[PDB]
Write a protein that binds this ligand. Structure first.
Ligand code: HEM
Length: 153
């Protein structure tokens, strides 16, 4: 469970994400695909993007980066009372996209990496620790929904 102080560390950095949602979302998806290329294979919509330059040049990918961060932000804003927000996501990721928890670990690592790269004087150990706790909670709760839905994850 996160404390109020930890949620305030998480939402203070989220405000920074909000100053450029498309840029952070684009950077996160490209870092995910660069670091874990097998995750691209889960996206029939984007597997044509066979180089990093092609990914950067894709407005459709950038649009999806915004969709992704918007959903994550809506979850984080609920501080752990996020059950309604999480439900459709766990549903689609379990039953349609079939995204294992390990790949949610990979994207959580990409989020942290990008927050560090974009925010050098502004994303320190306490903030990163708290963001890692919020993303762990996110993954924990998704995994509980995966199990109710019968999906190994
Ligand atoms: C922070 C984690 C994530 C969030 C918040 C997120 C959010 C979303 C949202 C809001 C959508 C559109 C609505 C839906 O279908 O549910 C979506 C679609 C999708 N997601 Fe995720 N996602 C996450 C992680 C991942 C990961 C790690 C993968 C794959 C390795 C993935 C694969 C997909 C696929 C395949 C689609 C459908 C894209 C399309 O063809 O339009 N998601 N995601």
């Amino acid at each position: 469970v996160l404390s109020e102080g930890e949620w305030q560390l998480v939402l203070h950095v989220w405000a920074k994400v909000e100053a450029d949602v498309a840029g952070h979302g684009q950077d996160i998806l490209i870092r995910l695909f660069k670091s874990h290329p097998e995750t691209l294979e889960k996206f029939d919509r984007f597997k044509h993007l066979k180089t990093e330059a092609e990914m950067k040049a894709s407005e459709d990918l950038k649009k999806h980066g915004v969709t992704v961060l918007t959903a994550l932000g809506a979850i984080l804003k609920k501080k752990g009372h996020h059950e309604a927000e999480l439900k459709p996501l766990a549903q689609s990721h379990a039953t349609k996209h079939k995204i294992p928890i390990k790949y949610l670990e990979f994207i959580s690592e990409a989020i942290i990496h990008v927050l560090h790269s974009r925010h050098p004087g502004d994303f320190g150990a306490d903030a990163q620790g708290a963001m890692n706790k919020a993303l762990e909670l996110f993954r924990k709760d998704i995994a509980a929904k995966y199990k109710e839905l019968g999906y190994q994850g």
